[PDB]
């Protein structure tokens, strides 16, 4: 059993379609320098219309901001994507479900990740080296260069709680290819 998260949603059309297609999480990117950036108000319009988990992605943002946005956009989860200190994440977790994203390129990054084992971990990737640690993480989420063609391969090796994607299903930045979302989820969950 594998959940699918569609990140970088900028319009309702895409959001709703992701839901119809079987997506379990939809993610809004609250990072200004991201081509998939979306404002809180714009997101709120979308988020509120969704019956599935809504996730906000933040990169090195201070907690007071994160909480405010979460409250306003009516987010369900928050994905901390920077170098946020453990105490910082716990203060946020006291108010809302948080996933910590950790960059992964080699083995030392995995140990760095274990320091946040208490929170759902989203590995930002080679699946090869995750193996000797796989059974240490609560709810591992896999991300990075995934697409319809390679998901099956990724899943079979790591067998993660959920799979994450963004550009793997785009027509161009910010806009999702409806046919690609269908194919991605289809392959991913094994239909």
From Swiss-Prot:
Gene3D superfamilies: Aldolase class I. It catalyses: N-(5-phospho-beta-D-ribosyl)anthranilate = 1-(2-carboxyphenylamino)-1-deoxy-D-ribulose 5-phosphate. GO terms for biological process: L-tryptophan biosynthetic process. Pfam families: PRAI (PF00697). It is an enzyme of class 5 (isomerase). Its EC number is 5.3.1.24. It comes from the Bacteria. Keywords: Amino-acid biosynthesis, Aromatic amino acid biosynthesis, Isomerase, Tryptophan biosynthesis. Belongs to the TrpF family. Homodimer. This is N-(5'-phosphoribosyl)anthranilate isomerase. The gene is trpF.
